Amino acid sequence: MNIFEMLRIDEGLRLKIYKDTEGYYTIGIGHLLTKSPSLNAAKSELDKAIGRNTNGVITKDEAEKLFNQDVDAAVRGILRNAKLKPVYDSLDAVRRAAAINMVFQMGETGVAGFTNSLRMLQQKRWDEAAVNLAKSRWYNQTPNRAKRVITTARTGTWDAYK
Ligand SMILES: [Cl-]
Ligand SMILES: [Cl-]
Ligand SMILES: [Kr]
Ligand SMILES: [Kr]
Ligand SMILES: [Kr]
Ligand SMILES: [Kr]
Numbered sequence: 001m002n003i004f005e006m007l008r009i010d011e012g013l014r015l016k017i018y019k020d021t022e023g024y025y026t027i028g029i030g031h032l033l034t035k036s037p038s039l040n041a042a043k044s045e046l047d048k049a050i051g052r053n054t055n056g057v058i059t060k061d062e063a064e065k066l067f068n069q070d071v072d073a074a075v076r077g078i079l080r081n082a083k084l085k086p087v088y089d090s091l092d093a094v095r096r097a098a099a100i101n102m103v104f105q106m107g108e109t110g111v112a113g114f115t116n117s118l119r120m121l122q123q124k125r126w127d128e129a130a131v132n133l134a135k136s137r138w139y140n141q142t143p144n145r146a147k148r149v150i151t152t153a154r155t156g157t158w159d160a161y162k
Contacts, residue, residue: 001158003071003097007104009161010145013063017042017056021142028063030104031070074100077108084112087122095121098153105145106138121153130154 011030017039020026025033025042033045039056046054050062078084078099088099099121102111112118114136120129130150133139139146151160 001097001161003100004067006097006152006158006161007067007071007101010101010105010148013060015058015060015063017046027058027066029067029070031063031066070104071100074104078103081108081112083115083118084108087118090122092156094156094158095153098149101149101152102138126154 008029013029014027017025017027017033020030020032024035025039025045027033027042027046031049033042033049036042043054043056046056046058049066050058054062078088084099084103088096091099099111114133117129117132120126120132130153133150133153134146136146139150148160152158
């Protein structure tokens with residue numbers, strides 16, 4: 001397992017525009033297109049992202065391409081963030097995947113706001129971090145995914161994904 005396989009599991013693969021858990025237009029492997037309630041807008045953002053008139057539908061390769069860019073951007077985002085990078089660098093490889101997943105889902109900003117958990121993660125206080133992480137809107141709105149990511153961060157193993 002790895003970050004790609006992990007997120008593919010959490011986000012799934014959809015080839016037609018869909019609405020995510022918060023109702024926003026998304027496509028592929030969790031590629032958010034827009035927070036706007038307009039399908040046309042979503043459609044315009046999609047054509048912009050792919051470089052052609054997609055008519056709301058994409059191929060699997062095109063979906064994987066956006067996923068790649070997205071994974072990439074997520075990491076880079078972490079590395080450029082002064083609050084995140086130090087935590088991330090202190091982590092082992094499995095745990096880092098958990099951090100990437102969260103950022104991919106909720107953005108750099110969101111995650112950077114988990115002050116208390118970031119510190120416990122940095123201090124290697126696994127159980128504590130896991131309890132603090134679950135005290136969030138995140139966990140309450142998508143609990144099953146949240147449990148997978150939290151277990152990953154808590155244990156450093158892929159057991160929640162096997
Ligand atoms: Cl894009
Ligand atoms: Cl969930
Ligand atoms: Kr992080
Ligand atoms: Kr994490
Ligand atoms: Kr975090
Ligand atoms: Kr954790």
